Scaffold this active site. Sequence first.
Site, mmCIF file in Angstrom:
data_model
loop_
_atom_site.group_PDB
_atom_site.id
_atom_site.type_symbol
_atom_site.label_atom_id
_atom_site.label_comp_id
_atom_site.label_asym_id
_atom_site.label_seq_id
_atom_site.Cartn_x
_atom_site.Cartn_y
_atom_site.Cartn_z
ATOM 1 N N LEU A 43 0.796 -1.219 0.000
ATOM 2 C CA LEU A 43 0.000 0.000 0.000
ATOM 3 C C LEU A 43 0.831 1.272 0.000
ATOM 4 C CD1 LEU A 43 -2.875 -0.738 2.554
ATOM 5 C CD2 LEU A 43 -2.849 -0.955 0.006
ATOM 6 N N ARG A 45 5.225 2.888 0.952
ATOM 7 C CA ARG A 45 6.550 2.752 1.533
ATOM 8 C C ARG A 45 6.988 4.128 2.009
ATOM 9 N NH1 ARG A 45 9.770 3.789 -4.017
ATOM 10 N NH2 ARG A 45 7.845 3.566 -5.245
ATOM 11 N N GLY A 46 7.717 4.167 3.114
ATOM 12 C CA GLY A 46 8.208 5.435 3.610
ATOM 13 C C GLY A 46 9.647 5.360 4.070
ATOM 14 N N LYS A 47 10.118 6.424 4.725
ATOM 15 C CA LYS A 47 11.431 6.379 5.360
ATOM 16 C C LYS A 47 11.487 5.294 6.433
ATOM 17 N N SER A 49 9.058 2.743 7.129
ATOM 18 C CA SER A 49 8.063 1.683 7.114
ATOM 19 C C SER A 49 7.729 1.277 5.689
ATOM 20 C CB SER A 49 6.780 2.136 7.819
ATOM 21 O OG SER A 49 6.088 3.091 7.023
ATOM 22 N N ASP A 154 3.635 15.089 12.751
ATOM 23 C CA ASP A 154 3.751 14.751 11.341
ATOM 24 C C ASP A 154 2.401 14.880 10.661
ATOM 25 O OD1 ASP A 154 5.034 14.089 8.995
ATOM 26 O OD2 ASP A 154 4.992 11.903 9.354
HETATM 27 O O1 LIG Z 1 -3.856 7.379 0.670
HETATM 28 C C1 LIG Z 1 -3.151 8.228 1.202
HETATM 29 C C2 LIG Z 1 -3.392 9.697 0.965
HETATM 30 C C3 LIG Z 1 -4.152 10.313 2.121
HETATM 31 C C4 LIG Z 1 -4.965 11.534 1.743
HETATM 32 O O2 LIG Z 1 -4.671 12.271 0.801
HETATM 33 N N1 LIG Z 1 -6.022 11.750 2.524
HETATM 34 C C5 LIG Z 1 -6.903 12.886 2.359
HETATM 35 C C6 LIG Z 1 -6.289 14.135 2.918
HETATM 36 C C7 LIG Z 1 -7.345 15.198 3.067
HETATM 37 C C8 LIG Z 1 -8.330 15.351 2.099
HETATM 38 C C9 LIG Z 1 -9.396 16.207 2.298
HETATM 39 C C10 LIG Z 1 -9.490 16.924 3.474
HETATM 40 CL CL1 LIG Z 1 -10.876 17.925 3.745
HETATM 41 C C11 LIG Z 1 -8.511 16.783 4.443
HETATM 42 CL CL2 LIG Z 1 -8.588 17.691 5.913
HETATM 43 C C12 LIG Z 1 -7.445 15.929 4.244
HETATM 44 N N2 LIG Z 1 -2.137 7.914 2.009
HETATM 45 C C13 LIG Z 1 -1.913 6.554 2.502
HETATM 46 C C14 LIG Z 1 -0.744 5.827 1.866
HETATM 47 C C15 LIG Z 1 -0.076 4.834 2.817
HETATM 48 C C16 LIG Z 1 -0.707 3.464 2.992
HETATM 49 N N3 LIG Z 1 -2.023 3.517 3.608
HETATM 50 C C17 LIG Z 1 -2.278 3.133 4.865
HETATM 51 N N4 LIG Z 1 -1.332 3.423 5.770
HETATM 52 C C18 LIG Z 1 -1.584 3.233 7.106
HETATM 53 C C19 LIG Z 1 -0.576 3.593 8.037
HETATM 54 C C20 LIG Z 1 -0.786 3.477 9.391
HETATM 55 C C21 LIG Z 1 0.258 3.960 10.373
HETATM 56 O O3 LIG Z 1 1.446 4.108 9.960
HETATM 57 O O4 LIG Z 1 -0.111 4.172 11.548
HETATM 58 C C22 LIG Z 1 -2.005 2.979 9.852
HETATM 59 C C23 LIG Z 1 -2.986 2.624 8.977
HETATM 60 C C24 LIG Z 1 -2.813 2.735 7.585
HETATM 61 C C25 LIG Z 1 -3.833 2.416 6.616
HETATM 62 C C26 LIG Z 1 -5.123 1.931 6.962
HETATM 63 N N5 LIG Z 1 -6.084 1.647 6.073
HETATM 64 C C27 LIG Z 1 -5.799 1.838 4.777
HETATM 65 C C28 LIG Z 1 -4.603 2.299 4.312
HETATM 66 C C29 LIG Z 1 -3.571 2.608 5.236
#
Ligand SMILES: O=C(CCC(=O)NCCc1ccc(Cl)c(Cl)c1)NCCCCNc1nc2cc(C(=O)O)ccc2c2cnccc12
Length: 330
Positions: A43, A45-47, A49, A154
């Site tokens: 899903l 990759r980061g620095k 994780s 962050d």
């Molecule tokens: O998809 C995006 C773009 C996120 C994005 O643009 N959002 C909308 C911003 C926004 C829009 C409108 C408004 Cl109005 C506002 Cl205010 C803000 N980034 C994710 C990519 C990484 C993999 N994704 C998951 N990483 C996880 C990591 C952890 C952790 O490290 O704790 C925990 C859980 C998850 C997880 C859970 N379930 C599904 C996927 C993941």
Amino acid sequence: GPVPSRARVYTDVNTHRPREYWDYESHVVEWGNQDDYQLVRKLGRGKYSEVFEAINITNNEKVVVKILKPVKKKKIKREIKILENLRGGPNIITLADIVKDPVSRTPALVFEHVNNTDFKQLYQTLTDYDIRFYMYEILKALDYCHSMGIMHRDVKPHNVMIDHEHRKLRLIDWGLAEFYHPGQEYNVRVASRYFKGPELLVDYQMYDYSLDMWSLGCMLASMIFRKEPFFHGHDNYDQLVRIAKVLGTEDLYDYIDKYNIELDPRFNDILGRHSRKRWERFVHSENQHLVSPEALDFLDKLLRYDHQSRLTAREAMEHPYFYTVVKDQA
Ligand SMILES: O=C(CCC(=O)NCCc1ccc(Cl)c(Cl)c1)NCCCCNc1nc2cc(C(=O)O)ccc2c2cnccc12
């Protein structure tokens, strides 16, 4: 030296806790077996994780597995203990399990799965109400973790999950989160460039929760003006120049003089002299439908050099910008 600073809310909450609440270095972790989960796909990759969709084989529930890249064992205990301390809090991602792959032995966190939306389609249909609704939801998560003695450090779009079909939001990646302690001097090499508070860019280390509220203001500004990121800097120093060209340089220099910050010898020759811009200058025909007096008033009260004069999470939730979303939540 630099002038001290204290958070003006939730200043001492960690001192009144039992030591084990924040002394994460002695937290004992019970490592389960990653063979409870079958990885489906990558899903992101980061620095720090790699993140995978996975299946809990016991009950077929979709889940998320964050395999931690090799950090100080300290920092893994820190993230776990923060996750454990915030469990059940409003709009905070829930940590479901803590495991090690039995062969590789590397540590990984298991999280709840959020059914995200097409964000490309989301940002092309965003309403004024949507921005106010989800800003409010992020503020609920920040006020709670702040009230729990914890800075996220962050805050950025990548760390907000949204299930729009269900208007459900989750703040994720607590791997840089930290306990607030009055007088502690923190690492400024946190957060992503575009969202770094001025305190990080001038190496003012005695910062607090208000760092998150700057980051939130960067999010607000990119949404409502449809400019992402709002401050688009080449590096850390050019990041402060981008900010200076908007907030102005009188104010930045009062900020320096107030906290007696020793400014890098690099900055003198690049910050220049700049007027504080009126927010109207960033309005145009393609974003006016999201800009309003209340939007701008609220944004301006988040983007302040001086961390101490930005709105607290709770103050932010009482701003007029949110009056109609607060009403509909009743
Ligand atoms: O998809 C995006 C773009 C996120 C994005 O643009 N959002 C909308 C911003 C926004 C829009 C409108 C408004 Cl109005 C506002 Cl205010 C803000 N980034 C994710 C990519 C990484 C993999 N994704 C998951 N990483 C996880 C990591 C952890 C952790 O490290 O704790 C925990 C859980 C998850 C997880 C859970 N379930 C599904 C996927 C993941």
